[PDB]
Amino acid sequence: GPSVFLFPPKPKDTLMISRTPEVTCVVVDVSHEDPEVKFNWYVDGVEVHNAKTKPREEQYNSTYRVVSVLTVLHQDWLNGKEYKCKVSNKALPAPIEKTISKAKGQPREPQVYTLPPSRDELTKNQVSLTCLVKGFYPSDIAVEWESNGQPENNYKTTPPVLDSDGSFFLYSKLTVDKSRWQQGNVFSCSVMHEALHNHYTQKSLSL
């Protein structure tokens, strides 16, 4: 019969107020024969109706992939509430239930440090600004950079790496022109995390 997978929101999204976090409920192959799917969604076992149905997609298998999307409130996801997707369909005898939620673990506060370029780099015409972020748990986090109220988008951010105490660290590198660094401009490393006061903090870096 039809198979079903449930998916969590993308981690940054649960922290960026400008993002919208969604749990996805994927139903794979439903027969061209009996193609209609019912979705029922429960939040901590309580039925909800704001879910968006996507138009079915034809699969090279000659089969139907059907998705329903459910937007979640940030604090709901952070506070560990359970999201259930119940699928119904006739290529199938009994409704299948799947449940998901946020992972367990005592959250820990990210420590943030910005380190200026090494003087050895100041011979190149672009230089690297580093933001070390460490001691954080879970790995769900968002880092970004800004200068003078405008965002700086020329940065890359390593994935979180597990440390010897079971916490995570990562580094973010912002590459800028040496003349911007050298002039005395103020750059800022910005971090969003569940375990920060107001879920957010920032650190400056200047010459």
Ligand X SMILES: *[C@@H]1O[C@H](CO)[C@@H](O[C@@H]2O[C@H](CO)[C@@H](O[C@@H]3O[C@H](CO[C@H]4O[C@H](CO)[C@@H](O)[C@H](O)[C@@H]4O[C@@H]4O[C@H](CO)[C@@H](O[C@@H]5O[C@H](CO)[C@H](O)[C@H](O)[C@H]5O)[C@H](O)[C@H]4NC(C)=O)[C@@H](O)[C@H](O[C@H]4O[C@H](CO)[C@@H](O)[C@H](O)[C@@H]4O)[C@@H]3O)[C@H](O)[C@H]2NC(C)=O)[C@H](O)[C@H]1NC(C)=O
Binding site for other proteins (CB under 8 A): 17, 73, 75-76, 78-79, 120, 190, 192, 194, 197-202
Q: Does 76 bind ligand X (CB under 6 A)?
A: no
Give exposure, 101-113, as e/b (b: 16+ Cβ within 10 Å): bbeeeeebebebe
Interface of this chain with ligand X, residues 49 to 68, rule: CB under 6 A: 59, 61, 63
Nearer to other proteins, 71 or 128 (CB): 71
Q: Write the CB contacts of 197 (distance below 8 Å, at least 6 apart in sequence).
A: none
Number of CB atoms found within 10 A of residue 191's CB? 23
DSSP string, 117-151: --GGGTTSSEEEEEEEEEEEBSS--EEEEEETTEE
SS3 label, residue 197: helix
Q: Does 130 bind a second copy (CB under 8 A)?
A: yes
Please count the residues of this chain forming the interface with a second copy, following the rule CB under 8 A: 29
Q: How far apart are CA 66 and CA 52, in angstroms?
A: 12
The interface partner of residue 156, options being other proteins, a second copy, ligand X, none and the CB cut-off 5 to 8 Å by kind, is a second copy
Q: How far apart are CA 96 and CA 124, in angstroms?
A: 59
Question: ω before 138 within 30° of 0 (cis)?
Answer: yes
The interface partner of residue 183, options being ligand X, other proteins, a second copy, none and the CB cut-off 5 to 8 Å by kind, is none
Q: Tell me how far, at minimum, the Cβ of 118 lies from a second copy, in Å.
A: 4
The residues that touch ligand X, with contacts defined as CB under 6 A, are 3, 5, 7, 9-10, 22-24, 26, 28-29, 59, 61, 63
Q: What is the binding site for a second copy (CB under 8 A)?
A: 111, 113-118, 120-121, 124, 128, 130, 132, 134, 154, 156-159, 161-164, 169-171, 173, 175, 203
